């Protein structure tokens, strides 16, 4: 539960869209570093709640975030303006740094179109090193949106969440 010693790393602002997203203010720099902490302890009007980030993206001025379990407008409005904390001894853990191909075999890659709708890009087929960076190879499947093979950079700003439980990888990557 709520850690005794904690640091405020941000604040959920206004509701964004109709799919439960929310604008969020970060106390970290670069701002998106707030997304490397898992989980989040937010103080809502109905007590404390622990929350996991599923995906996020910069939008014009600032940032908008998608929290696991918050999928509608009403779910976002009831969190609006709540503060975000982390334990004093909580180290950031970006999933890109914590996972390797062997752990990812057979996961579905979920991208995001311009209209913030989740698209089944396909399945992770390979994850190699080029020398300068790591690249994730995604191949189409019968479930997939199309038949293309996509090269997606294995960088924390693109591949944001690995969820072995759901067998999915959430990436801020579009169709075209
Ligand atoms: K397909």
**Domain segments of the chain: what residues?**
1-93, 94-176
How far, in Å, from the CA of 118 to the mean position of ligand 1? Answer: 15
C-alpha gyration radius of the chain:
17
User: How far apart (Å, rounded) are the C-alpha atoms in residues 21 and 147?
Assistant: 30
Residue 17: strand, helix, or coil: coil
Say how far apart CA 78 and CA 20 lie, in whole Å. 10
- Residue 116 CA to ligand 1 centre (angstroms): 20
- Distance from residue 144's CA to the centre of ligand 1 (Å): 4
- How many angstroms does the Cα of residue 143 sit away from the middle of ligand 1? 5
CA distance 89 to 107: 31
> CATH classification of 1-93, choosing from 3.20.20.140, 3.20.20.190, 3.40.190.10, 2.40.30.60?
2.40.30.60
- Tell me how far the alpha carbon of residue 147 lies from the centroid of ligand 1, in angstroms: 5
Experimental method, per PDB record: X-ray
Closest CA to 138 of 171, 162, 161, 112: 171
Span from the CA of 5 to the centroid of ligand 1 (angstroms): 48
Residue 70 Cα, ligand 1 centroid: separation in angstroms?
A: 28
Q: What are the respective helix, strand and coil percentages of the chain, to the nearest 5?
A: 10, 45, 45
Query: Rounded to the nearest whole angstrom, what is the distance from the C-alpha of residue 120 to the centroid of ligand 1?
Result: 9
Preceding peptide of 130 cis, ω within 30°: no
Q: Resolution in angstroms, to 1 decimal, for this deposition? A: 2.4
Residue 93 CA to ligand 1 center (angstroms) comes to: 32
Distance 117 CA to ligand 1 centre (A): 17
CA distances from 1 to 35, 38, 51, 69, 85 (A): 19, 13, 11, 18, 12
Q: Rounded to an integer, what is the distance from CA 169 to the centroid of its chain? A: 9
Q: Which CATH architecture has domain 94-176?
A: Roll (2.30)
Beta bridge partners of 6: 87
For residue 12, give the nearest of 85, 93, 105 by alpha carbon.
Answer: 85
Spell 121-153 as b/e; 16+ CB within 10 A means b: bbbbbebeeeeeebebbbbbeeebeeeeebebb
């Amino acid at each position: 539960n709520v850690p005794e010693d904690r640091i405020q790393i941000g604040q959920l602002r206004s509701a964004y869209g109709l799919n439960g997203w929310l604008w969020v203010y970060s106390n970290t720099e670069p701002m998106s570093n707030m997304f490397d902490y898992l989980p989040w302890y937010i103080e809502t009007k109905a007590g404390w709640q622990t929350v996991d980030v599923k995906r996020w993206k910069p939008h014009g001025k600032g940032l908008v975030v998608s929290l696991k379990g918050v999928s509608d407008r009403t779910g976002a409005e009831s969190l609006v303006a709540s503060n975000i904390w982390i334990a004093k001894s909580q180290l950031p853990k970006a999933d890109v740094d914590e996972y390797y191909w062997s752990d990812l075999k057979g996961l579905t890659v979920l991208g995001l179109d311009d209209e913030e709708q989740e698209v089944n890009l396909g399945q992770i087929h390979e994850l190699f090193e080029t020398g300068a960076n790591d690249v994730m190879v995604v191949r189409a499947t019968p479930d997939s949106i199309d038949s293309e093979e996509r090269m997606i950079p294995w960088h924390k700003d693109v591949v944001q969440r690995v969820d072995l439980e759901a067998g999915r990888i959430y990436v801020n990557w579009g169709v075209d």
